[PDB]
């Protein structure tokens, strides 16, 4: 919602102030993530995890908060857009991590082999008799 | 209270033919 | 279009006949040894 | 300071409440987001200072699936994001269950929200609760509502528009259970009911309109019409303004007796009203016509006790007296013996809105006819037929007792509409 | 929310509940990696009903699966959809039933209630407002019938107050699989009574006429059958999932259904069954969809109607339609034949409409009916179980688990007032 | 001429002013190393950061505070964070081993050998002031620095100081909700200072300001960040009259002259009107009569009790930004139609009103919306009684079987607190229910 | 700052020492040379705890390494991090006990207990303000149970007013590793009992099930165990070197969870072990952190909380949580589950917060349960105790040091009244 031509300032497109829907907030399953990526790498900051965080991302999200979100003047006009220098940092081989690896594990084994240790659920047992845990 | 309204005042429970 | 432009407030509103004061609105026209004095209809 | 607070309990209260907010919305300045794109809006909306008007309406209903519509379509910018208020489960079809369980953990926020919408208001005319008698939470969470607003705000007037069920066709089993017993209850605490019938609605839409194969919308946007009839003379002006106080006084004689019905009289497509003349003497003969009211009893079969005439338009008092006393003049249309006046009259000059995309017409002449007759006695009598049909073998109480009710409250709700039912045959007479 | 916590049980509930799975994961478009790739967006905010919530936007079924052995287990999870369930949700037994209800019940069976008691709470507690349960098994197996009424038996005195649902496959009369199978469907159908609210009755020779008669089929294997039994399924929660006309949960379809606390055993059905050569010859409206549902051929129950009289019937529309010719087909099904319907009763039909259809379809319909003809289901059970237990046929493989031999003759009693009830609430005027 | 010395007790008091500060330091022109860029206030007179603020030698702003804990887990964050230059290096006192939740640690052990140097400082920080107001005192009551070292600190700063007025914000134990299991052994043994040796008590519940946060904000899952910003906007706008101008003001004498009817009942309650997100400001206005009617209901009080149950005693009404005598007026005659408000009999009038021509201050990344308008009631109830009653019945089920007092007595301190503390409780409960009976006959037959 | 002296005697406490050394210099960021390679600023603030400022910015840990045959000291010194002790800290003999509790505690120990005793003088004298001490050790072995309990019984009088902790591995229900095993149980539980502040109860098949269901681990070597010992050992001192919203010490959780004297033994757990194939098939996030925490299947001693009521209950946390979330989960876990937990204590649930979590995980919890289950491990102690003693087994292997059998009588005299004692608050 960031990019408009006709609100390009200095070759950076910004964000007009009458286009903002006060209820997108309250809309948790509309704007959200379905797939992402993996990596076939080891866990770490690098530069082909997309939504990868450092400590320079939370700075950054403190200070523009304590900068009023990027105001734009104009002539005429006390705030007309916000700037779009706000929210590049949220704007982007690599495989798909939700494609289940249990398939590739060992298969369930019964209650029973589980069992091997100590005995949990014996029908003759105290805690049978008892209220259980919920 | 028997069948039908009795002379004396008091409420009309029509179905209980009281 | 739909971005028109952002005027500038200083054009566009002085060359008039008079002074058009501004804490009561009053419109002095002062001629040669005349004057009619207006206000806010 | 002539405000009408709104409440809408249940499904069919909140797509009743979808169409009227549109009505609402087109007839005065309203933009479906709220703003500006001339105080007559003051009635239904409220006043921010900034630009935005907000309705001075509940939505309130315990199935959360009817009311996450309306806070994600068109008009979700419109409402208040806390007015929507929504439940966890429903009633089912319980009026015991939304009376007693369900319906007591919900009661204080939908009060609350009511003072605060009262706080707004200086000139409180009074309140419209829209509901049907057939469902759960419109029979037993409507009645626990105005039960506890009765005593929230006394004797303010509060106006039911319910869909009562129908002879013919049903959408459940178990609603002479809940028509029972809500109706032992809004005796007590309802100034007036205005009564609507599903099935005349649809033979008025297949007959009366050009529309086959109608929705439920279709329904609901004649009630619509008809409630803002209701109320357009507060909100614009008129030859002979009506108020809401003013109804009650010459269309309600009894306290027992307060079940008028409704008529919107030029029902008309837009290509049927191309050829018809819609003047004041063509279309107040459509009020009394039998085929064209919407609840299923016939005035035939009983006597008219009153008559509220709204007319909306261009209608001089000329043909209205002219066209009053042709309707007088004819004898299919009889009075009781005990009015020989009948008749109450409002003139309003403002035209009824139309919806783009209903089926209504472009009209310069509205007349919203409210009477009580009684013929509507034989709704009781067949309902009471049904009832205690069913109460014979016990054929449902297991679903009622235990959710929170006893065996008793059938019985006495039911003589109770032993003694509302012939409480109309010494009127009559 | 209302969620709805799936319980499998033994190769009948685990060959239903992959299909119902995948079905469901076609109404919502998940793909078997468990992500989201619908078309629309009215696919998501209702998708807690089924589905939890895991890391990275992992949509797991909210499905327990239980088996004595593991020859199907092991089938079902490397199948094309085995990958969306919870590892953990696997629990299986080494030495199986072996077609014995007392092994299931009282001796094995009762060694592997406790883990899926442990799964089960720890499935019902992460729920915010649970609805109910919902189980699939057969009655003619060992442990579909022991443990999963053992299940049964276990969940409701510790859940008190949810709706419990069985999807049971009651043993065919005349095609058979197990020969001691009448003493399993007598001493389940015992126990189904007291710790259900819903029972929905299926036979595999009607679901086997169903496919050589109305879909043509030629070669049904059990996945058809599966598809028959999951549509049906699927189409009574629908309501929950997607927003419509008329709403209707399982509660709503439970309070309107059933009068006592004795008669929950329905019939179901669906209604557009067509081969594939009359797939374009075909108009898919409302009176074809009403009149394929009320025909005697429909039913998944070898009980014809004619032979009873209907208590209830229920019917859950699908698909974008309007509301007038709904309910005038049911009121015109309500008229014509009205000799199968309980006078005592007036309205004896439940009528909800969603307008999400099934994809491929443009309507489609579920039935649901309660009717006094499944006596003759019941008493045929017990006349092959007594031409069985008075010999003592197959007696030594339920004595000798210490099963008391009088639980065969109260079984028996229990199975014998069920069908007198059921008798006198037919003729009762 | 108006200073106000803030002391912050314990890991609630230190976290209170880590946002109270940040508050101040926002609401006048100071930056966070301490420097005031503009001499000109948009509503005060060149001075009004006396109240909070003092200047140094080198064109400096040093606030009036004391930071106290037994353990610098939490103070070293203060002197590593943003404001690591504000503080004096000195004004953050810090000990060695906390009293772990033990009264008698931070009473009788712990907290003797570093009550002198927080006296030190206090003395310090006074001596410079010459118009000092009263203090602001921040603690909780669950805990063993914040009840017990407390508890020192109020019963010297008592015989110091004389009858200097002094005030805390302290944190009450919830009825269902708790961190701590000996937490009602510490919130009973401390009510003896609360009552003896203060003028204003404040309770604040944390499972209170839950509900407000979840409810009348957008915000679920909250943490004490957001808690914590609700207080420090309560205590602003206690305060705003010592250093704004206003159409009424009010100082901290005129409110426990209007608030306290006897010495031993200065137990009122706070609750901030116009919490609202942004969200939800923008469909509803917030005039004068919205945000009085919304004071008085009972999910946006900020303890769990019920005022319908009690009569109010007295009121104490606070307001800044858009107001002008005239709403006031029409809000206070508004709110005495109704019935469910119900004050006692011996207060006809039963109102203060204050008015501030400021509004409130927001920081970067708060919950509240910039508002035009906002009100503070603070008022007494007698349905304050039921949290004392609920805490009565902890105290008495614990100690009936003697649980947790070996980690009391050994401490030094004699096992006979208990008792006196439940009978001084007692005799509240008997005081605060003598002051609420009419002083009417119940009619007749 | 709050300074932990660790020790540890034994095999089994050499062995756990090691891992837990081993993960201590991960989270702190230490290389194997001693010094520091980490990326952040608070893995130095609080570093005292567990090490000391030396030459060659460095750090070295406070342990004291304690064994009456160096045999498994080998193992450790020749470990990737068996650099980084101190020379001094091992102290050994030259002939072991022989899994003997008399051998440990008067004839071996007693030549031992000076130089162990010199070392942690020194060690404990080099702190600024010394918080308490740590022992790991086992209830089995026979330089651990005599050896650990005669340090505890020689410090203590040095060092009264102080924490002592024992994260001692207690005796197994189903198969033992030494025959002799319940009379040094016994002998060490009566010790643990008077001169022990908090100690935390450990079972070995508690961990092979949470090895073999949990975590569905195929090959597990005693690493893998010693690795959950080690984590959630460093979990209960977590708030000490770390900030937090909640901060609880040592002395916090021994106020807290210890109701009278004689109750400190403890169940520990470790909320965020899910197995590898499981991993993404479940979320991260309180409630699915607190019910794993409250788990029978979690527990690391072999007695469910069915079998007994629930005392009191910690649960110390890490990372970026809510505080509502936590007091409102564990409030629901005590309104649930009403029947086993002490209706005479309002709040069972002590709880804590803090601020960094372990690397690699969002969230992470260390469930410590105070129950009264602990009670039926103790009586099957002393039934086999009982049985062995009545025909005096193998008590010439005790006499023969110098032993009097009224110890035995009287160190099961103990144990009887403590399980009477935590019977007491049964109902
Ligand atoms: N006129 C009209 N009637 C409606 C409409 N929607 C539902 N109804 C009526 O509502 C009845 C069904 O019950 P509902 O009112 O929906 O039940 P509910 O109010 O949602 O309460 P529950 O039964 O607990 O779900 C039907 O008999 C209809 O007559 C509508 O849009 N217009
Ligand atoms: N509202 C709020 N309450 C807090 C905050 N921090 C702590 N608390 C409360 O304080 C109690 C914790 O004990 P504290 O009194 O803070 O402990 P302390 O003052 O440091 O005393 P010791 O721990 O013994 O040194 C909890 O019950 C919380 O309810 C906070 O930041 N905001
Ligand atoms: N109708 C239908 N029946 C099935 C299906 N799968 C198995 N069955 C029936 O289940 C009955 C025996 O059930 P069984 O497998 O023994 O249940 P078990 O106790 O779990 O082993 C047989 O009559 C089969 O016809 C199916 O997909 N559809
Ligand atoms: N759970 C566990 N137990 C251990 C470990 N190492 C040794 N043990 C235990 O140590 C006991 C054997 O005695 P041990 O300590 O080796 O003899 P000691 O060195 O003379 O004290 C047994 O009870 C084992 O359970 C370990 O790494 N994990
Ligand atoms: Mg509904
Ligand atoms: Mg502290």
Not at chain 4, 385 to 397: G, I, N, P, S
Not at chain 5, 45 to 74: H, S, W
Not at chain 5, 242 to 263: C, E, I, S, T
């Amino acid at each position: 919602d960031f990019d408009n031509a006709y609100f390009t300032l200095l070759g950076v497109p910004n964000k007009p102030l009458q286009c903002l829907d006060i209820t997108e907030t309250g809309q948790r399953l509309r704007n959200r993530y379905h797939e992402g990526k993996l990596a076939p790498i080891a866990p770490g900051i690098n530069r082909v995890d997309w939504p990868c965080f450092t400590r320079a991302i939370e700075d950054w999200s403190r200070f523009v908060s304590s900068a009023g979100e990027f105001k734009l003047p104009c002539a005429s006009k006390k705030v007309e857009s916000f700037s779009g220098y706000a929210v590049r940092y949220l704007k982007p081989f690599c495989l798909n991590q939700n494609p289940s690896l249990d398939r590739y594990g060992q298969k369930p084994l019964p209650f029973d082999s589980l069992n091997a240790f100590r005995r949990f659920g014996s029908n003759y047992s105290r805690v049978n008799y008892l209220t259980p845990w919920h | 209270t028997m069948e039908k309204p009795p002379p004396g005042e008091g409420v009309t429970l029509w179905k209980s033919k009281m | 279009t739909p971005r028109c432009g952002c005027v500038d407030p200083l054009p566009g509103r002085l060359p008039f006949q008079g002074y058009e004061s501004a804490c009561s609105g009053r419109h002095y026209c002062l001629r040669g040894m005349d004057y009619c004095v207006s206000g806010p209809p | 300071m002539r405000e009408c607070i709104s409440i809408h309990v249940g499904q069919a209260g909140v797509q009743i409440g979808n169409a009227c907010w549109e009505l609402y919305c087109l007839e005065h300045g309203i933009q479906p987001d709220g703003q500006m794109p001339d105080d007559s809006f003051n009635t239904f909306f409220s006043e921010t200072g900034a630009g935005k008007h907000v309705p001075r309406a509940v939505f309130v209903d315990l199935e959360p699936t009817v009311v996450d519509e309306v806070r994600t379509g068109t008009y979700r910018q419109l409402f208040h994001p806390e007015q929507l208020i929504t439940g966890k489960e429903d009633a089912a079809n319980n009026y015991a269950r939304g009376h007693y369980t369900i319906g007591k953990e919900i009661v204080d926020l939908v009060l609350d929200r009511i003072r605060k919408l009262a706080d707004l208001c200086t000139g409180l005319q009074g309140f419209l609760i829209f509901h049907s008698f057939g469902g759960g939470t419109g029979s037993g969470f409507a009645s626990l509502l105005m039960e506890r607003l009765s005593v929230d705000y006394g004797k303010k007037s509060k106006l039911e528009f319910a869909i009562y069920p129908a002879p013919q066709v049903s959408t459940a089993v178990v609603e002479p259970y809940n028509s029972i017993l809500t109706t032992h209850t809004t005796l007590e605490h309802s100034d007036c009911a205005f009564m609507v019938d599903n099935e005349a609605i649809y033979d008025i839409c297949r007959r009366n309109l050009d529309i086959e194969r109608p929705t439920y919308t279709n329904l609901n946007r004649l009630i619509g019409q008809i409630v803002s009839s209701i109320t357009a003379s507060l909100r614009f002006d008129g030859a002979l303004n009506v108020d809401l106080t003013e109804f009650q006084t010459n269309l309600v004689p009894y306290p027992r007796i307060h079940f008028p019905l409704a008529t919107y009289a030029p029902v008309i497509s837009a290509e049927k009203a191309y050829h018809e003349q819609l003047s004041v003497a063509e279309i107040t003969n459509a009020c009394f016509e039998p085929a064209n009211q919407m609840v299923k009893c016939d005035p035939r079969h009983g006597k008219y006790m009153a008559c509220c005439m709204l007319y909306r338009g261009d209608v001089v008092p000329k043909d209205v007296n002219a066209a009053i006393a042709t309707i007088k003049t004819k004898r299919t249309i009889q009075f009781v013996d005990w009015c020989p006046t009948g008749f109450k009259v409002g003139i309003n000059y403002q035209p009824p809105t139309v919806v783009p995309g209903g089926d209504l017409a472009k009209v310069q002449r509205a007349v919203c006819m409210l009477s009580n007759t009684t013929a509507i006695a034989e709704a009781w009598a067949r309902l009471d037929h049904k009832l205690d049909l069913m109460y014979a073998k016990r054929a449902f109480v297991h679903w009622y007792v235990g959710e929170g009710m006893e065996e008793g409250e059938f019985s006495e709700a039911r003589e109770d509409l032993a003694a509302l039912e012939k409480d109309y045959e010494e009127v009559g007479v | 929310m209302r969620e709805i916590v799936h319980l499998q049980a033994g190769q009948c509930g685990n060959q239903i509940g992959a299909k119902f799975w995948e079905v469901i994961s076609d109404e919502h478009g998940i793909d078997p990696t468990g992500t989201y790739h619908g078309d629309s967006d009215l696919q998501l905010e209702r998708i807690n009903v089924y589905y939890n919530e895991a890391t990275g936007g992992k949509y797991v079924p909210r499905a327990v699966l239980v088996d004595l052995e593991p020859g199907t287990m092991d089938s079902v999870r490397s199948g094309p959809f085995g990958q969306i369930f919870r590892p953990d949700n696997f629990v299986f037994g080494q030495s199986g039933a072996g077609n014995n209800w007392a092994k299931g019940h009282y001796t094995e069976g009762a060694e592997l209630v406790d883990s899926v008691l442990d799964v089960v709470r720890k499935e019902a507690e992460s729920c915010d407002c649970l609805q109910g349960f919902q189980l699939t098994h057969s009655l003619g197996g060992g442990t579909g019938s022991g443990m999963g009424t053992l299940l049964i038996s276990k969940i409701r005195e510790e859940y008190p107050d949810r709706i419990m649902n069985t999807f049971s496959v009651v043993p065919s009369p005349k095609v058979s699989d197990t020969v001691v199978e009448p003493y399993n469907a007598t001493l389940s159908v015992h126990q189904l009574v007291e710790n259900t609210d819903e029972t929905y009755c299926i036979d595999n020779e009607a679901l086997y006429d169903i496919c050589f008669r109305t879909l043509k089929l030629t070669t049904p294997t059990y996945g058809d059958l599966n598809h028959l039994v999951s549509a049906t399924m699927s189409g009574v929660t629908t309501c929950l999932r997607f927003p419509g006309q008329l709403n209707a949960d399982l509660r709503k379809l439970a309070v309107n259904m059933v009068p006592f606390p004795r008669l929950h055993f329905f019939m179901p059905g669906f209604a557009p069954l067509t081969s594939r050569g009359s797939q374009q010859y075909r108009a898919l409206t409302v009176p074809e969809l009403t009149q394929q549902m009320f025909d005697a051929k429909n039913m998944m129950a070898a009980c014809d109607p004619r032979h009873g009289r209907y208590l209830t019937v229920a019917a859950v529309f699908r698909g974008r339609m309007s509301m007038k010719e709904v309910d005038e087909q049911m009121l015109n099904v309500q008229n014509k034949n009205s000799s199968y319907f309980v006078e005592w009763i007036p309205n004896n039909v439940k009528t909800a409409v969603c307008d999400i259809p099934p994809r491929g379809l443009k309507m489609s319909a579920t039935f649901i009916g309660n009717s006094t003809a499944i006596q003759e289901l019941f008493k045929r059970i017990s006349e092959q179980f007594t031409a069985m237990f008075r010999r003592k046929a197959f007696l030594h493989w339920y004595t000798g688990e210490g099963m008391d031999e009088m639980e065969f003759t109260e079984a028996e009693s229990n199975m014998n007032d069920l069908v007198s009830e059921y008798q006198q609430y037919q003729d009762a005027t």
